[PDB]
Design a protein around this ligand. Sequence first.
Ligand SMILES: *[C@@H]1O[C@H](CO)[C@@H](O[C@@H]2O[C@H](CO)[C@@H](O)[C@H](O)[C@H]2NC(C)=O)[C@H](O)[C@H]1NC(C)=O
Ligand SMILES: *[C@@H]1O[C@H](CO)[C@@H](O)[C@H](O)[C@H]1NC(C)=O
Ligand SMILES: *[C@@H]1O[C@H](CO)[C@@H](O)[C@H](O)[C@H]1NC(C)=O
Ligand SMILES: *[C@@H]1O[C@H](CO)[C@@H](O)[C@H](O)[C@H]1NC(C)=O
Lengths: 96, 453, 169, 68
Amino acid sequence: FASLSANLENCTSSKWVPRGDYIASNTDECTATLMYAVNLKQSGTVNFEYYYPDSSIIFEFFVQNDQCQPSRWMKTTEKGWEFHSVELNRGNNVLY
Amino acid sequence: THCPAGTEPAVGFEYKWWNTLPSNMETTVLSGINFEYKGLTGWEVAGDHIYTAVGASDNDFMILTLVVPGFRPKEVARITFVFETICSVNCELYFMVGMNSRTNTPVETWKGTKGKQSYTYTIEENATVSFTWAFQRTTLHETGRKYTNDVAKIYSINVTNVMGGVASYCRPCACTSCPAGHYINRDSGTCHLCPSNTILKAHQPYGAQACVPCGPGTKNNKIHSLCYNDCTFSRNTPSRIFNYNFSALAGTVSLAGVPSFTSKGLKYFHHFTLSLCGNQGKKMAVCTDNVTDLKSVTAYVCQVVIIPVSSQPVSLADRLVGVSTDMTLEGIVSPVELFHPETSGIPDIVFFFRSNDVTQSCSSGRSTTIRLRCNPMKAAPGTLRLPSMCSDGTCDGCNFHFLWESVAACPLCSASDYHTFVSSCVAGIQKTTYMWRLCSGGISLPEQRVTIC
Amino acid sequence: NQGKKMAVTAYVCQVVIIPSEVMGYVSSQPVSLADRLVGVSTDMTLEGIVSPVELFHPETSGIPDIVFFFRSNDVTQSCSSGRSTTIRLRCNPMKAAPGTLRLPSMCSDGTCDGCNFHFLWESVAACPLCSASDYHTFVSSCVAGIQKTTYMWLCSGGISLPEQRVTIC
Amino acid sequence: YIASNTDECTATLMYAVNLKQSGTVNFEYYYPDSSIIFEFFVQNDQCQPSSRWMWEFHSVELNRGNNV
Ligand SMILES: *[C@@H]1O[C@H](CO)[C@@H](O[C@@H]2O[C@H](CO)[C@@H](O)[C@H](O)[C@H]2NC(C)=O)[C@H](O)[C@H]1NC(C)=O
Ligand SMILES: *[C@@H]1O[C@H](CO)[C@@H](O)[C@H](O)[C@H]1NC(C)=O
Ligand SMILES: *[C@@H]1O[C@H](CO)[C@@H](O)[C@H](O)[C@H]1NC(C)=O
Ligand SMILES: *[C@@H]1O[C@H](CO)[C@@H](O)[C@H](O)[C@H]1NC(C)=O
C-alpha cells in the first residue's frame, strides 16, 4: 500500500492513517490517496467494506487498468458498514 | 377532555415525563470502537427525563431514534427540545434529521457542558423525518466505563403538525381555511380580513395579533405571507419630495469576491445572489447543492460559498425589516464605516431583510443589510461592489452587507430641479433654456422658445 | 515611443494563440503588421489604402471619424500587394474608460479582407481639442440691475470651465 | 516505419510491456517539422510519471515495473 498524500490546488501530515482494525481518512481538506498495485494473474473482483458517515468528505474508488486507462464516486452508507465490489481484468490493475 | 368542535383538530407530541417510553422512539447503541450497531439500550428512562445509559464503552454512541411518517398540515413543523447536559468533557449531541429517509445529517451539534435550553428546527417540506440524538461521552478512547456522569437530559419534546398522533393540544379555527389575507378567528365566527398593508402569521391562528402590519416603504402581498417592495421609495424633505427608484434592481446579479486560501492550499470565495425587490414578493434567489448531484433556500439574498462547488446554502432574506434612508430600522444597522462616502453626496439608502433562521453563532438571528447608492458616472444598469474592508462580508458574524451603485438609484427630481438660465429682454431678444443642475429620469429637457419683447 | 515599434517588431503584432490550459501548459504564427507608415488623417483613403468602414458601426458622436494606416513590408503569395493594416479611430463621450478597443462584429477574426486587418478603438481623448468659442454661451442681459455670465460646453480637455462673475449694470 | 497523424489531433501509440528486468528502449524517430510535437514518456507500475519531449537515435531507461 502506498499512502500518497498531496495538496489539491501543509496537509502532508494528513493522510490515510492505520487507526486500528480499520484505516481512517484525513478529516482536513487534502487529497489522501491509498493506492495498491496488484498484478491479477486471473480475472477477479475486489471486496472491501467502507464506512461513509457524512457527505462532507467524498470517497473515490477507481481501479485504473493495465494501460493506465481509467461511477467512481461511492454513494453514502447508512446504518451498517455496507459492502462494495467491482470487477477487475487480467491486467496489472492498480487500486486507488 | 374533548377538543371543542370550534377548534380545529390538532394532534401534537408532548412527552414531559418518561414513565412509559413512547412507541415512536426506540433506543440503539453504536459502538464507538467498531462503528457497528450493538443493539443495546442506549437511553434509560427515569420517569421525568431520559439520559444516556452506559454501554460497553463511554465512546459508544447512545442513539434514541424517533420516526414520524408524515406531517399533518416553510415552517410546517417546529420541533422543540429541552436539553440539559450534566456531561463533563467531550460532550456532543449529534441531533440528526433525515429528510425523506435520506442519509442522516446533523443540523446542530452542541459541544461541551450546557444547561437547559430550547432549540427549534424547520421542516422545509413534508416527508418522512427521523430525529436521532446521538451522544458520545468521550471523544478520546480509554479502556473501561470510567465516565458515567456524562448524561444528557431531555425531559420535554414538542412536535407540531404530526400525522397519526395523539391530540395533546388543539389549536383554534373559525372549520374552513379562510382566503389569503383573512385572519382565522373563532370568536368572530366568520372569515375576517386583515387591515390593508398587513401580513398574517399562521403560527398563531386565533385573532389578528399574529397579523402584523408591513414596514415603511413596503406594500402587502395578496397572500399576506410576506411584505412586498414597490421598488420606488418616496420620502418627504423640506425642499421637495425625493422619489428613489430601484425598478432596475429587481433582477438578480452574480458578484463574488476574490478566492482566499485556507490554512492549507485550498481556496474559496463567497458568492451571493441578490434580488432587491419586485416579482410580487417572490424571493426566488435560491442556492442548490449541485456538487452533491455530481438543498435550496428561498430568500431575496442567497448565501453560498463556491470553490473553483455549490455548498453551504443558507437563506439571508426571509423577513422584511424595513426600507428607508435612515441607518437604523427596527434595531438593525449597516456598517456604513466600511462603505466609502459616495461621490454624489445625497443621503444614502439602505434596505433591510432579516432571515428567520437562528443558530448558535447568531443568537439574534441572521439579519442582512443592503446599502444603496447612486453615482452619476455609473452608466451601467448596475454595479454591485463588495466592501473592501470585509471581502467575505461575514466580519460582523450575522450582518452580510454589499454595496450597489447605479444611475437609477437617484431620486426622481421634481419640476423645479433643473437650472434656469432664462435671458432677459434687452435689445428685443430673450432666450429661455432649462437644463438640470442628481436628477434621475423625469420629464425630458425643455426646448428653448423665442418671443418678441 | 519615438517611433519604436516594440509590439517581429511592429506597431501592430499578429499572433493567433490557442488556449494554454487546453494544450496542457501557445504563441505561434507571429507576423508583423505595421512596418511602414502610410499616412494619418481623417480621410478614408490615403495612398490607395482604405478601411472597411461598412463593418464599423456609425459612431454616436457623429464627428468625422479618424483612421490610421500602417503597412507591413512583408509580401506573401496570398497578399500580392503586401500586408496593409488599417486602424479606425473613434471618439465616444460615454467611454469614461481610458480606452475601449472593440473588434469588428462582422469580421471577428479581422482577416476577412485577406490583407487588411482592422480594429475599432473608442476613447474620450480621441475627440478634437475644442477651441475657445466652442463652449455654449448663456450670459444674462441687464434687466433689473442684475446680469449673469455662465459658460459651459464633443470637446476634449482644453481650458477649464470659466466661472460666473457679477457686475452692476 | 509508422507515421504520426498530420492532423491537429491527439493520437497516442501505447505499448504495455512487463519488464521482468531493468532495461532500455531504443527507437529511431524522425522529426521533419516542429508543427507536430513529440512526447515520449514511461509510466511505472503504480500508474505514475517516472525529458517528456523529444534519422537520429533515442533511448531512455526503464524499471522492473509493468512499464507502459
Ligand atoms: C451547478 O450548476 C453549474 C453546472 O455545471 C455549475 O455552475 C455554472 O457552471 C457554468 C459552466 O462553466 C458557468 O458558466 C456558470 O457561470 C456557473 N454558475 C454560476 C452561478 O457561476 C456548477 O457545477 C454548479 N453551480 C452552482 C452555482 O450551483
Ligand atoms: C510543510 O510540510 C512539511 C511536511 O510534513 C511539514 O513538516 C511542514 O511543517 C509544513 N509547513 C508548514 C505547516 O508551514
Ligand atoms: C408546541 O409549542 C407550541 C407553541 O405555541 C404549542 O402551541 C403546542 O401546543 C406545543 N405542542 C404540544 C404538543 O403541546
Ligand atoms: C407526507 O409524506 C408522506 C410520505 O413521505 C405521506 O405518507 C404523507 O401523506 C405526506 N403528508 C401529506 C401529503 O400531508
